[PDB]
Design a protein around this ligand. Structure first.
Ligand code: FES
Ligand code: FES
Lengths: 120, 120
């Protein structure tokens, strides 16, 4: 039912301080009691789980909350999961693009401020 | 011959403070004079140029210096340029790999701590 900060932590593989962070950026929330004695809900593990994946996928921490704006059913996950992949892919290509800029420049070596793609 | 900090800056597109940084991490060097009146050498533009590309390629700032250990002739560039590309590529795939982990998990949505690749 209600998990202690230390519990969510040990079971989500992240420091308590992170749950704080993830709380400051308003990604997860708590329910104080008897002298602000905080606590979290079962599902919370699911979020942090998703949050990590998200970070691992390269999604900026902010854009996380934004997509966290639209019971974390596989239906919902389908969403964040996709928008994020599609995002990952966009990045993937940006590098593949840079990889190519490199490919050309290697044999060159002019590093011309004026014309070298790597330089622009 | 000798470029003022402000000159290397305006012509390399980076703040003077960066040349400082790039000097702290020992990537470029200066030649004080008449009351520590610093100054840089012609070639220095070339380095910073390379440094930026490097950063743009994703190469960690440290590993820059290390590869800066082995007249910046197209011969030399061939080196750093390659080791870096080869590096970029390795990264490129790591994501393509993650992209796939995602691809599978999307339709799922179990986010099982136990078995979900995205989770490990
Ligand atoms: S190094 Fe000459 S085109 Fe880039
Ligand atoms: S969400 Fe089920 S395998 Fe990853």
């Amino acid at each position: 039912a209600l998990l202690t900060p230390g519990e969510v932590a040990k079971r989500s593989g992240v420091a308590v301080s992170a749950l704080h962070f993830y709380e400051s950026k308003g990604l997860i929330t708590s329910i104080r009691n008897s002298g602000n004695q905080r606590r979290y809900k079962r599902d919370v593990l699911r979020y942090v789980a998703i949050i990590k994946i998200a970070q691992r996928i390269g999604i900026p921490l902010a854009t996380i909350g934004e997509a966290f704006g639209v019971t974390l059913s596989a239906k919902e996950w389908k969403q964040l999961s996709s928008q994020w992949r599609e995002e990952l892919d966009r990045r993937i290509h940006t590098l593949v693009a840079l990889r190519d800029e490199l490919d050309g420049c290697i044999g060159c070596g002019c590093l011309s401020r004026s014309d070298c793609p790597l330089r622009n």
